[PDB]
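Q: For a teaching session next week I want to show students how multiple molecules come together into a single three-dimensional assembly. I've collected the sequence lines for a complex. Could you give me the predicted structure tokens for the whole thing so I can convert them for display?
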Amino acid sequence: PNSDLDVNTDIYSKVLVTAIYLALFVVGTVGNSVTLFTLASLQSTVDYYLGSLALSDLLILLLAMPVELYNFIWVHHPWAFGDAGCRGYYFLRDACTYATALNVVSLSVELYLAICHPFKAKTLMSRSRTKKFISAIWLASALLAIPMLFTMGLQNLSGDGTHPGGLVCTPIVDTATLKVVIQVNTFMSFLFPMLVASILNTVIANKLTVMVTEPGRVQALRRGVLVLRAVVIAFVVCWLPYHVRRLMFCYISDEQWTTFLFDFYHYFYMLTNALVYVSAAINPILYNLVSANFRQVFLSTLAC
Amino acid sequence: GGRRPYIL
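A: Of course. Below is the structure for the complete assembly, covering every listed component.
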């Protein structure tokens, strides 16, 4: 039969996750949309980074969610979006995480410079250079996501490999290569940049206390530190189970895979990817809570 | 021994 590819997650849990996804879609899409409109100097250079983040969030909510919600949560087989939709999906997902992880570190660097060397940053990097750096990050992010264009692909996992219902989107490379391509992503998009940003966020948090006479600059910095602090924490917590599941996918041996671990993996998949869409919806919520100037103008642009 | 997930 062609039931060997059926994923047996109960109907109730599917509805539960769908309700969560749809809610995070509404919160996330609206959140990041009027965030871009709100953004449209140092307060302004930071605007390009926040704008770059909101873009990486809109892409994953508009393009990745409706694809995943259909072919990964409800209808597991067959894959309906072609080979390009298979390769482009995992490409877009990896590229955005790199873009986000690099933006956080970039903000951590620039915020450090705004506190420790405010005169060195007085003759700051031109609006043009910051925009070039935003573009460079995106392109570098795409280069790092290249392996996904070759690691992923369409396979027919039916009995004889002939039945259309067995056409699924799955890694098409050997298990050894897959471990390597997953490791590189886990290191470069998660472990490495977050460890750096955490160290920077530790230094800034201490340096800020050390510093504490014309403008209300110190209030703006405090906003800058705590938002960034929350973003790093929110990024780590959300993406940690995600990377574990991917390692779990390829490091568990074939003789080790039972019917329990199979079903556990797919319920785990729901939770890990739910936190992914939380990560792409939390930022506009974070901006509103702390910055008093931003939240009111946010709601004013929301009515408009 | 048993089934392995094909979804990543």
